[PDB]
């Protein structure tokens, strides 16, 4: 059906690239496919979708979705800050680089020893803090994504719960590196494995349930 | 006209990805399209082509070409040295990372409150120079032409890089797609080790690959 009519959705997808010079960057391996799928499913179910996309596995701009393209984490933060006021739902599915090189050259570096790094802003935490300080009165659902693994410091669910708690978002989509939907009300739903489209359907369903209650 | 019939060519294309941990890497913005086009033109003109491809997931495999996929500069080095002894022509079109992180983490590196450590770096082996070295030392008897690529922002550094690497032909500034609003530097050259410089018109990747292969074919029959 069209159970998302009127809802303005802001989605981020793909990995960011943190330049060292015009040709080299620090990047990550995320394809952006899962975020695109959520944007497509949101748009199909009646939402006005803006998709902020970084580096993608040659993906095609989805139909009927406003596209914003970005390169680095800082440009993603600016674009989200730009469009966040008009959004009812923020879906932070982008793999945002946690650091950027301390210096960026305008011309290719030629033939060095060490790259100094500086921390990037947490865009998801910024949206959570802004909504709680009354600056995003239109925002009804903030969704983060996380890939978690168990290790010597804790099982996978322990780490996923700690992330939900630290971020403070309404829903945390957890991929167990299948996974979970962790809500801010404590509910914990297993996310059955399937294609990127099928898992997007379950995510959007979860967003819909959290909106129809609020 | 199969002017490359009976020629076995090994082509490298794409950028390498130097891992920091399982999900992060140092990479570069090379698409690999120019090397794919050289590989395609070689096969279209009769060559038996093996293509060693880096970060090029979005590109179509050229028809008639054997694909070898690699990730890092070190995997490209091992693949070239494995396949070079069977080739007659080596076309080094890959944007090979000059450096790699000195330690690759086993787990995803977690952000802390601590100040970020730097990324310590170490040089990767010069794969093109390793091939030239191996030929000079008698290990590549079948090798008839080693082709390197270079970007220099021009003829001072192009002729200089030519003699530092020691290859047979240097393609300089075969960049761009003649795309709207990309500045045409008029920087393209084909430099031969035998003393020939030819201007590379900055057109499509295909017209450039055609010019590159024309030069390889004229260099081979020169022998
Ligand atoms: N600078 C950042 C980093 C991440 N995120 C968002 O925060 C969520 C969680 O990202 P994750 O990588 O799991 O968490 P971090 O808190 O960055 O921690 P770590 O990498 O140490 O696990 C994702 O939806 C991501 O889009 C963000 O908004 N800004
Ligand atoms: N580790 C490397 C680096 C480069 N190359 C090859 O060398 C040629 C020229 O690369 P170049 O840009 O000259 O790299 P460097 O010699 O390190 O110089 P620069 O600092 O300008 O990049 C290309 O054909 C490339 O495939 C290589 O085989 N192995
Ligand atoms: O944490 C690192 C990192 C630091 C040192 C190292 O040897 C390997 C990785 C990092 C660097 C750049 C970046 O963009 C990023 O997100 C990162 O997490
Ligand atoms: O040239 C650099 C470089 C050096 C210092 C700096 O601040 C930024 C970039 C480089 C770094 C990492 C890498 O993997 C690589 O191949 C490289 O050529
Ligand atoms: O560069 C090469 C190399 C490149 C091409 C070729 O045909 C043969 C060797 C190399 C290979 C292995 C190694 O250990 C090394 O240090 C190296 O420099
Ligand atoms: Ca992170
Ligand atoms: Ca180089």
Curated annotation (Swiss-Prot), chain A:
UniProt-listed GO biological process terms: coenzyme A biosynthetic process; pantothenate catabolic process
Residues that coordinate or bind CTP: 92-94, 98, 108, 110-111, 121-124, 145, 163, 167
Cofactor: Mg(2+); FMN
Regulation: Two related chemical scaffolds that potently inhibit the activity of the CoaB moiety of CoaBC through a cryptic allosteric site that sits in the dimer interface region of the CoaB enzyme were identified.
Keywords of this entry: Decarboxylase, Flavoprotein, FMN, Ligase, Lyase, Magnesium, Metal-binding, Multifunctional enzyme, Nucleotide-binding
E.C. numbers: 4.1.1.36, 6.3.2.5
Segments of this protein annotated with the region Phosphopantothenate--cysteine ligase: 9-214
Annotated cofactor note: Binds 1 FMN per subunit.
Catalytic reactions of this protein: N-[(R)-4-phosphopantothenoyl]-L-cysteine + H(+) = (R)-4'-phosphopantetheine + CO2; (R)-4'-phosphopantothenate + L-cysteine + CTP = N-[(R)-4-phosphopantothenoyl]-L-cysteine + CMP + diphosphate + H(+)
Gene Ontology terms: cellular component: phosphopantothenoylcysteine decarboxylase complex
Gene Ontology MF annotations: FMN binding; metal ion binding; phosphopantothenate--cysteine ligase activity; phosphopantothenoylcysteine decarboxylase activity
Subunit structure: Homododecamer.
Function noted in UniProt: Catalyzes two sequential steps in the biosynthesis of coenzyme A. In the first step cysteine is conjugated to 4'-phosphopantothenate to form 4-phosphopantothenoylcysteine. In the second step the latter compound is decarboxylated to form 4'-phosphopantotheine.
Protein name: Coenzyme A biosynthesis bifunctional protein CoaBC
Annotated organism of origin: Mycolicibacterium smegmatis (strain ATCC 700084 / mc(2)155) (Mycobacterium smegmatis)
UniProtKB/Swiss-Prot annotation, chain B:
Keyword Repeat: no
Disulfide partners: none
Single GO MF annotation: phosphopantothenate--cysteine ligase activity
The protein's Enzyme Commission number: 4.1.1.36, 6.3.2.5
Keywords assigned: Decarboxylase, Flavoprotein, FMN, Ligase, Lyase, Magnesium, Metal-binding, Multifunctional enzyme, Nucleotide-binding
Pathway: Cofactor biosynthesis; coenzyme A biosynthesis; CoA from (R)-pantothenate: step 2/5; Cofactor biosynthesis; coenzyme A biosynthesis; CoA from (R)-pantothenate: step 3/5
GO biological process annotation, one example: pantothenate catabolic process
Cofactor note: Binds 1 FMN per subunit.
Positions annotated to bind CTP: 92-94, 98, 108, 110-111, 125-128, 149, 161, 165
Keyword Iron-sulfur: no
Entry GO terms, CC: phosphopantothenoylcysteine decarboxylase complex
Cofactor(s) the protein requires to work: Mg(2+); FMN
Catalysis performed (reactions): N-[(R)-4-phosphopantothenoyl]-L-cysteine + H(+) = (R)-4'-phosphopantetheine + CO2; (R)-4'-phosphopantothenate + L-cysteine + CTP = N-[(R)-4-phosphopantothenoyl]-L-cysteine + CMP + diphosphate + H(+)
Activation/inhibition comment: Two related chemical scaffolds that potently inhibit the activity of the CoaB moiety of CoaBC through a cryptic allosteric site that sits in the dimer interface region of the CoaB enzyme were identified.
Subunit structure: Homododecamer.
Function according to Swiss-Prot or TrEMBL: Catalyzes two sequential steps in the biosynthesis of coenzyme A. In the first step cysteine is conjugated to 4'-phosphopantothenate to form 4-phosphopantothenoylcysteine. In the second step the latter compound is decarboxylated to form 4'-phosphopantotheine.
Family: In the N-terminal section; belongs to the HFCD (homo-oligomeric flavin containing Cys decarboxylase) superfamily. In the C-terminal section; belongs to the PPC synthetase family.
Protein name per Swiss-Prot or TrEMBL: Coenzyme A biosynthesis bifunctional protein CoaBC
Biological source species: Mycolicibacterium smegmatis (strain ATCC 700084 / mc(2)155)
Range of the intact protein held here: 186 to 412 of 414
């Amino acid at each position: 059906h069209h159970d998302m009519a009127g809802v303005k959705a802001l989605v981020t997808a793909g990995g960011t690239r943190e330049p060292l010079d015009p040709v080299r960057f620090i990047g990550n391996r995320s394809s952006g496919k899962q975020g695109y799928a959520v944007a497509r499913v949101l748009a199909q179910r009646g939402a006005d979708v803006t998709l902020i996309a970084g580096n993608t596995a040659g993906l095609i701009d989805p139909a009927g979705v406003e596209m914003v393209h970005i390169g680095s984490a800082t440009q993603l933060r600016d674009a989200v800050s730009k469009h966040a006021p008009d959004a009812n739902v923020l879906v932070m599915a982008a793999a945002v680089a946690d650091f950027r090189p301390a210096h960026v050259a305008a011309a290719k570096i030629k033939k060095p020893s060490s790259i100094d790094l500086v921390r990037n802003d947490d865009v998801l935490a910024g949206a959570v803090r802004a909504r709680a300080d009354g600056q995003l009165p239109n925002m009804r659902a903030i969704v983060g994504f996380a890939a978690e693994t168990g290790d010597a410091n804790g099982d996978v669910l322990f780490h996923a719960r700690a992330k939900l708690e630290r971020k403070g978002c309404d829903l945390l989509v957890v991929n167990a590196v299948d996974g979970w939907l962790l809500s801010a009300d404590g509910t914990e739903s297993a996310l059955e494995h399937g294609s990127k489209t099928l898992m997007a359907t379950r995510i959007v369903d979860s967003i819909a349930a959290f909106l129809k209650s609020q």
